[PDB]
Structure 1
């Protein structure tokens, strides 16, 4: 599924991501924009052989099982495929564990490089929330 901007903002709010760990909803929408362009089916292979999955490009190195990432963990206790669902529940629950891990949203390199410090409220501007 390719979400609309406000449609994803509303879905993230419904699933309790708005101000989760102090990160306003625009931060989450911005990260999703640059990680996946709002596409739940986004996948990207890393040089190290891990894969990133879903709207927030969650990595098989630590967070999900894909059966093909040697030495990896599955700290969200999910198949990485669950992160590709039209239903964002698995991505949101796993992102809450990631952003709690100590470095906040810096875990998302595209958030650090493209969202951090910017006017992230622009990403929810106009949305009925």
Structure 2
């Protein structure tokens, strides 16, 4: 599923990401924009053989099991394919665990490079939330 901007914002808000650990809704929508272009089916292979999955490009090295990342962890305890669903529940739940591990949203390189320190509220602007 390719979400609309406000559609995703509302779905995220409903799943409790607004101000989750100090990160306002605009941060998560910006992050999802540049990681996956709002596409839940987005996948990307890393040079180390791991793969990033879904709307927030969660990495198989640490967070999910895809059965082809030797010596990796499954810290969110899910198959990586679960992160590709049109229902974003598993991605959101796993994201909550990632953002709490000490490094905040700096875990997402696109957020750090493209969202951090920008006017992130522009991403939820005009949306009925």
TM-score normalized by the length of structure 2: 1.00
| Alpha-carbon offset, residue 114 of structure 1 | 0.2
| Alpha-carbon offset, residue 122 of structure 1 | 0.2
Distance 1:96 1:60 in 2: 16
Secondary structure class of the residue paired with 2:32: helix
1:80-129 Cα deviation digits (max 9, x unpaired): 00000000000000000000010100000100000000000000000000
Distance 2:93 2:108 in 1: 15
| Alpha-carbon offset, residue 2 of structure 1 | 0.1
- In the TM superposition, structure 1's runs of 4+ consecutive aligned residues that sit over 6 Å from their partners are none
RMSD: 0.3
| Alpha-carbon offset, residue 13 of structure 1 | 0.3
Distance 1:21 1:62 in 2: 21
| Alpha-carbon offset, residue 57 of structure 1 | 0.2
Secondary structure class of the residue paired with 2:75: coil
1:29-85 Cα deviation digits (max 9, x unpaired): 000000000000000000000000000000000000000001100000000000000
Q: Which runs of 5+ in 2 are unaligned?
A: none
TM-score normalized by the length of structure 1: 1.00
